[PDB]
Design a protein around this ligand. Sequence first.
Ligand SMILES: [Zn+2]
Length: 349
Amino acid sequence: PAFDKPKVELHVHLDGSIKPETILYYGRRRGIALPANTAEGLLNVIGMDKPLTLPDFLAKFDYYMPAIAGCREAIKRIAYEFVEMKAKEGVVYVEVRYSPHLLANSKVEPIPWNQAEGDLTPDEVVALVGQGLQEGERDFGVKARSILCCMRHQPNWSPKVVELCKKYQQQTVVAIDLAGDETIPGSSLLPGHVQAYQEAVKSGIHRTVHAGEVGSAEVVKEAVDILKTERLGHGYHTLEDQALYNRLRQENMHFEICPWSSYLTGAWKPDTEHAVIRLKNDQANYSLNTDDPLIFKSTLDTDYQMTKRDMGFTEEEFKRLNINAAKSSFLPEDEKRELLDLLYKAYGM
Ligand SMILES: [Zn+2]
């Protein structure tokens, strides 16, 4: 264990943190053609061993999402099982993100994963995921919060998403995200997406955006200045624009680093200095995350030991980034202080 103290996770998707044996049970009980009948072999088609491309990583979801989406018991259980997982790895606070439309099967265009029309609405999916997170926290003692994803290819969804972020603000929902295929040109300025971050600014909904993961620094630059996000998912290619980088450094922008994810998705070619090193060297505001452990065959200790032996991270630095993650969390002022006192008490400060 590279860092055996309480950690914080801000960027990990519920979509990509399902147990391969939970998928298997629901794929069977719904009679769904899964690319495998065996847990360890399911993880061989879905798991990634080498670097690929962004469209190919997103393609892996087409394998197993039909078994989960549209079924109630499967939706809530993976939430409960997700927080369980995070507990076993030393996480005291976790913000888990997911697209309620991609788990629904009714009142959604398009019905994802080629499902048939049913009765599970996006507004219902958030009430079921939140229930699993609420029951998990009570069983495992780790504070767990949803973030609702926009899809870059469906700007028609994002009007409903913020709006959902607002109905469930007093539940588990703390912010809105913009995920999906960043390789689609100009998907950041689609009108559907922009009302969403605009209505989020008015009504005080927190904002994070996948930006700079496989695109240019212009991707990050509209996310910052147009959508006015407060955190960057995979802020890697911000470092190609030093003027912008040092501006966000001066404005204490938080970067949601995912080291092992960044290697397997091709985001970081292994010949390059990883972005997180100088963001450590510049003492920037960043955190370490798993992104999608099922698809990357990872745990959060995978991402911590990637830093430790390969990028020269220390226990000292591990303490600082997790405290920065705690004060760039989307928790309210009272709970985010209570979380800082947890980490203060465990870190010797
Ligand atoms: Zn992500």
